[PDB]
Amino acid sequence: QAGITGTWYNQLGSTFIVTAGADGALTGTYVTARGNAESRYVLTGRYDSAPATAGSGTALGWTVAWKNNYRNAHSATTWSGQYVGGAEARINTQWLLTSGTTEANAWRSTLVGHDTFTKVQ
Amino acid sequence: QAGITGTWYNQLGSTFIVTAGADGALTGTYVTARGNAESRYVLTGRYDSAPATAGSGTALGWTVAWKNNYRNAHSATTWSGQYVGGAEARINTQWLLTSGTTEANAWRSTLVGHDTFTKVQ
């Protein structure tokens, strides 16, 4: 919560700038490694706003739809994972990237992967 | 063993022909919707040859690499799921389809989806 709020970088140099609200809201901006205004997208999500327990992560998820004022990639990614604190806080995630398709190409619409974010970068 | 052994059909016109060995082996042939010789591929996998009760499913998996004597799509799919016996038997699965890529494009290497198979043509 206090730990989640801030600026995060993944392994590719993408930037995740997030506000964790008192009641479970995630809001912010996802910035592709390019870095310019054309690379900034709105994000929203939710996290478990219960006080953190002994050594367990905090579940969270968020969505970016890849449309902004400059570009539309006709797709959206959801990240699902958990925040861990400590000397080296991290957010470990798996993601799904769904593209808009014809129904004939729907079987081919969703990529899967994983990202790790650190507040160091 | 005699349950899984047979010919299965998915929702989109693909067929797969499997022998379930008593040792947990799965061996057979996957046929895409085209249904001609260029559409046939080797499949191999494994299953739990002593499932836990009469009402629980039987966990299984198999792989197809999409290379045969005729074509090569430089990709492989794995299906993971469970066999549900009885008199309307099913195999319910989730699949991952990975394509060979450069590391630069590894992000787009793995698609995810789901398939339900029945013994009804």
């Binding site: 592709t32 997208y41 890849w66 990639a73 797709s75 593209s99 081919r108 990529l111 | 992000w107």
Partner: peptide, 9 residues
């Protein structure tokens, strides 16, 4: 999917 995507540029 496309060849290039903003998530991984």
């Amino acid at each position: 999917x496309p060849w290039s995507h903003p998530q991984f540029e």
